[PDB]
A paper describes a structure:
The trimeric serine protease HTRA1 is a genetic risk factor associated with geographic atrophy (GA), a currently untreatable form of age-related macular degeneration. Here, we describe the allosteric inhibition mechanism of HTRA1 by a clinical Fab fragment, currently being evaluated for GA treatment.
Next, we determined the co-crystal structure of the LoopA peptide bound to Fab15H6.v4 at a higher resolution (2.1 Å) than our cryo-EM structures, which allowed us to identify the precise molecular interactions between LoopA and the Fab15H6.v4. The LoopA peptide aligned well with LoopA from our cryo-EM structure and bound to the exact same paratope region and with similar orientations of side chains contacting CDR1, CDR2 and CDR3 of the Fab. The two mutants D52A and Y100A had the greatest affinity losses (2000-fold and 200-fold, respectively), likely due to the importance of D52 and Y100 in interacting with the key LoopA residues R197 and R190, respectively. We further validated the importance of the HTRA1-LoopA for Fab15H6.v4 binding by deleting the entire LoopA and replacing it with a beta hairpin motif “NG” (HTRA1PD-ΔLoopA). This HTRA1PD-ΔLoopA construct did not show any detectable binding to Fab15H6.v4, confirming that LoopA comprises the entire binding epitope.
Residue numbers in the entry:
A (entry chain H): 1 to 221
B (entry chain L): 1 to 212
C (entry chain E): 190 to 200
The structure:
């Protein structure tokens, strides 16, 4: 199975540089190209550049020439994108993607790495339960969740029960609070009949502040 | 550079409708590739070299065109086709993409299921009270949430966000958070979330009494 | 198989 695993989200100050990694597996790394594509709020997708490991060089889109450095370590099957002199316009999700054949679309993509360019201080979130109770029931179903409050920058990821619970989950887009900090909620609807036997834990991850929080959400007593 | 322009930038259609997305290149290209991107996910290959379905792509997708004019057709739109579609060329350097086309799904009206969450005791210890109101699985998107504290209509102390359209049932969900200091929260008894929606014959209120 | 950018042939 082909996998492209990227490094975690980062916050960087304007003028600083960022280096993103893309660890490849499931194919012959030296026999394919690795490309970098970004998705910025302002545009859709933009090709940054790429590398064919059997060339000792890299290709760049003229827009990024002199500011981006694309490298590769054939021994660890890892491709890297370094972007320097970071500006506000560089806040974007950066994807690595495999260039397999000229007649075929970029067939495998990394999960993306959000890079935020800001002078503001990183802040880890506070995680609070959204407890199921008589106020969060609907025709035999109970809603419950986690409130992930006051973090910076984005993203926060939320899983339920280490990813074993996915059905009925809604992790909401973050809201920007007046303080400049973000907040989000992640909810799930489950049978109200099994609230005393099942365990619901939200796994909260905020890579920029290295925060990992597991919160068990119990019915309110 | 070869500029890729898609039309329309967004469209909405019902399940079973036939949908078209055009891609125009500012200069002739050998072919284009199409990608499909679901929200919060990486793009996935959809069509290779104008008309060849990528691996695992259902038969309802087709691609046609040549030179500067290309079309993606979805013969029977399905709920899981909610995504942004992108065309791309690499016949000329730099490789360029279209701006994307958001495809949204029209479906029948569905009333929200409304839930209310008082602040946790842990949050209260920290000096703040966030009261969360959840509107689950409704259609259309337009929904009105009003916060009422001891029956007084609130303004300027809440924030809301809506999810992307669900990939299976094409509904939205909405979260609304009322934030007050622990002192302001402790001054009042009744906390009510009042919901107005096309699917509700009259507004639905979910409420609780502080410390109950 | 021709690599997209480099056009390198890989059998």
């Amino acid at each position: 199975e082909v996998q492209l695993v990227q490094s975690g989200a980062e916050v960087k100050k304007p003028g600083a540089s960022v280096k993103v990694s893309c660890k490849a597996s499931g194919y012959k790394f030296t026999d394919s190209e690795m490309h970098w594509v970004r998705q910025a709020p302002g545009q859709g997708l933009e090709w940054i550049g790429g590398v064919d490991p059997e060339t000792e060089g890299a290709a760049y889109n003229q827009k990024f020439k002199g500011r981006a450095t694309i490298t590769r370590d054939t021994s660890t099957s890892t491709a890297y994108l370094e972007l320097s002199s970071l500006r506000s316009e560089d806040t974007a999700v950066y994807y690595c993607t495999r260039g397999y054949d000229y007649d075929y679309a970029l067939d495998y993509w990394g999960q993306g790495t959000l890079v935020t360019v800001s002078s503001a201080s990183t802040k880890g979130p506070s995680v609070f339960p959204l407890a199921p109770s008589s106020k969060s029931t609907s025709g035999g179903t109970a809603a419950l969740g986690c409130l992930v409050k006051d973090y910076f920058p984005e993203p926060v990821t939320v899983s339920w029960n280490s990813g074993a619970l996915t059905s009925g989950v809604h992790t909401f887009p973050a809201v920007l609070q007046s303080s400049g900090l973000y907040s989000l909620s992640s909810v799930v609807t489950v049978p109200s009949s099994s609230l005393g036997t099942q365990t619901y834990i939200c796994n909260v991850n905020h890579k920029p502040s290295n925060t990992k929080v597991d919160k068990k959400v119990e019915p309110k007593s | 550079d070869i500029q890729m322009t898609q039309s329309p930038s967004s469209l909405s259609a019902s399940v079973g409708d036939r949908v078209t997305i055009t891609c125009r290149a500012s200069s002739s290209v050998e072919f284009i590739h199409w990608y499909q991107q679901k929200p919060g996910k990486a793009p996935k290959p959809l069509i290779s070299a104008t008309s060849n379905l990528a691996s695992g792509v259902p038969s309802r997708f087709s691609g046609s065109g040549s030179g500067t004019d290309f079309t993606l057709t979805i013969s029977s739109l399905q709920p899981e086709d909610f995504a942004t579609y992108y065309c791309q060329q690499w016949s000329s350097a730099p490789w360029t993409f279209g701006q994307g086309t958001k495809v949204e799904i029209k479906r029948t009206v569905a009333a929200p299921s409304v839930f209310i969450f008082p602040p946790s005791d842990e949050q209260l210890k920290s000096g703040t009270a966030s009261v969360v109101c959840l509107l689950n699985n409704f259609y259309p998107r337009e929904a009105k949430v009003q916060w009422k504290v001891d029956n007084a209509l609130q303004s300027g102390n809440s924030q809301e966000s809506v999810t992307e359209q669900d990939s299976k049932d094409s509904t939205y969900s909405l979260s609304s958070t009322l934030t007050l200091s622990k002192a302001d929260y402790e001054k009042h008894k009744v906390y009510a979330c009042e919901v107005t929606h096309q699917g509700l014959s009259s507004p639905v209120t979910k409420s609780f009494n502080r410390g109950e | 198989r021709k690599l997209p950018f480099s056009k390198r042939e890989v059998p």
